[PDB]
Amino acid sequence: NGFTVPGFITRRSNAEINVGDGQTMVISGLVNPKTAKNVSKLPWLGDIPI
């Protein structure tokens, strides 16, 4: 109504591990690529180069 409710961008990780003293451990990593293409054309004129 006027009570704005927000959404969030979150990066979270809840891990249970065991390591030696002073060692570096990675508990999460991500690589995420995404791509999308849409084309609209006329039937025969659209395919002419350039």
Partner 1 sequence: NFGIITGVLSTINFALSNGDAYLIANPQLSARSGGRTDFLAGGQVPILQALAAGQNVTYKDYGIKLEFEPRVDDDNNVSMRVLADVSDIDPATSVSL
Partner 2 sequence: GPRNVATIPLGQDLTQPPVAGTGVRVTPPLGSLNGAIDLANLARPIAGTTNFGIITGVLSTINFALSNGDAYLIANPQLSARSGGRTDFLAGGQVPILQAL
Footprint of partner 2 (CB under 8 A):
3, 5-6
Report in angstroms how near the CB of residue 42 gets to partner 2 at its nearest: 10
Would you say 38 and 25 are in contact if contact means Cβ atoms under 8 Å apart?
no
**Contact flags string 17-36 toward its own copies, x per CB under 8 A:** --xx--xxxx--x-xxx-x-
Instruction: Please choose, from the candidates 35, 33, 29, the residue with its C-alpha nearest in 3D space to the C-alpha of residue 11.
Output: 29
Indicate which of partner 2, partner 1, its own copies, none lies near residue 20 (CB less than 5 to 8 Å, by partner kind): its own copies
CA distance 42 to 12: 47
Nearer to its own copies, 10 or 18 (CB): 18
